[PDB]
Design a protein around this ligand. Structure first.
Ligand SMILES: CC(C)c1cc(C(C)C)c(S(=O)(=O)N[C@@H](Cc2cccc(C(=N)N)c2)C(=O)N2CCN(C(=O)CCN)CC2)c(C(C)C)c1
Length: 247
C-alpha cells in the first residue's frame, strides 16, 4: 500500500494473508485475501494461476505481521483451491480475477471467530456503493514502487470509487476496464494499493454494513496520476461464488 497508515488485524479482522511453501523451507508471501465464511477465503486467481497446487499454500488469519507471529493468529491449509475457469490476462486488464480457498487447520476445523478473526459480508446482487464513495483496502504490499520488500506491519488506506465512465476514458484505461471491474483511487493520486496487495479486500460501508465490494486485481504502476486501481466487482460474481461454495 502506497501512502496510507499502518494498522493491526483488530481493525481488519477479515484479512487473510496467503503464503506459498517452497522446496526447502522458505515461505514467501503471495497475496492477500478475505474471509467470507468460516471455511472460505476469497482472493484473486492471478495470484495462483502459475502454481495451482493447493499444498504449496498457507493461509493466516488474525495476523498483523509479515514475518512474525501475532497472538491469537490461526494457521490453515488449503483444502480446495478454486480458480475461475474464464480467467485471462491481457496487456493490463486481468479478467475474472477471483478465487476461492477452502481452508482447514491440521485438526480439520475451520476459522473460529474472535476479536481478531471476523468474516466480512458479501454484497447483494448488483448492489454496489454509489460512485464517489470512500472505501478501504488492506495489505502487505509495497509502500513505493522502488521497493523490493514488503512492509512487516499491515497497512491500509482509503480510496474513492470511480465510475465506469471516468475509468473508461482514453487517458485512464480505455475499453480495457469492463463492467465486471471497479476503479478506485485517491483523488490526489497520493495513496493506492500496489504489488502485493493483490487478492486483498476493497471494503465499503454499504448501508451501515461493512461489505466486500472488490478484490485488488490490477493497475498501471502504483499511485500514478489517472491510473486507478482496478478491482474485481464482487457483486457480479455472486452466482459463481455461491455455486462453488455449496458443494
Ligand atoms: C505480470 C507483469 C506483466 C506485470 C504487470 C503489471 C500491470 C501492468 C498489470 C505490473 S504493475 O506494476 O503495473 N502492476 C502490478 C502491481 C498492482 C497490483 C494491484 C493494484 C495496483 C494498483 N495500481 N492499485 C498495482 C500488477 O497489477 N500485477 C498484477 C499482475 N501480476 C501477475 O503476476 C499476473 C499473473 N498472471 C503482477 C502484479 C507489473 C510490475 C512488476 C511492474 C508487472
Amino acid at each position: 500500500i502506497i501512502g496510507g497508515e499502518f494498522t493491526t488485524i483488530e481493525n481488519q479482522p477479515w484479512f487473510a494473508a496467503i503464503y506459498r511453501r517452497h522446496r526447502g523451507g522458505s515461505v514467501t508471501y503471495v497475496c492477500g485475501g478475505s474471509l467470507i465464511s468460516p471455511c472460505w477465503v476469497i482472493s484473486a486467481t492471478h495470484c495462483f494461476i502459475d502454481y495451482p497446487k493447493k499444498e504449496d499454500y498457507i493461509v493466516y488469519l488474525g495476523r498483523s505481521r509479515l514475518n512474525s507471529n501475532t497472538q491469537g493468529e490461526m494457521k490453515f491449509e488449503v483444502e480446495n483451491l478454486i480458480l475461475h475457469k474464464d480467467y485471462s490476462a491481457d496487456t493490463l486488464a486481468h479478467h475474472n480475477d477471483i478465487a476461492l480457498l477452502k481452508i482447514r487447520s491440521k485438526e480439520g476445523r475451520c476459522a473460529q471467530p474472535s476479536r481478531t478473526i471476523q468474516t466480512i459480508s458479501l454484497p447483494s446482487m448488483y448492489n454496489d456503493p454509489q460512485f464517489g464513495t470512500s472505501c478501504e483496502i488492506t495489505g502487505f504490499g509495497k509502500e513505493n514502487s522502488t521497493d523490493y520488500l514488503y512492509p512487516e506491519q499491515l497497512k491500509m488506506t482509503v480510496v474513492k470509487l470511480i465510475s465506469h465512465r471516468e475509468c473508461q476514458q482514453p487517458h485512464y484505461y480505455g475499453s480495457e476496464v469492463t463492467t465486471k471491474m471497479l476503479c478506485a483511487a485517491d483523488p490526489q493520486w497520493k495513496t493506492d494499493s500496489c504489488q502485493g496487495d493483490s487478492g486483498g479486500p476493497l471494503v465499503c460501508s454499504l448501508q451501515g454494513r461493512m461489505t466486500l465490494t472488490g478484490i485488488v486485481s490490477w493497475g498501471r504502476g502504483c499511485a500514478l496520476k489517472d491510473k486507478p486501481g482496478v478491482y474485481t466487482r464482487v457483486s457480479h460474481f455472486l452466482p459463481w461464488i455461491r455455486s462453488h461454495t455449496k458443494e
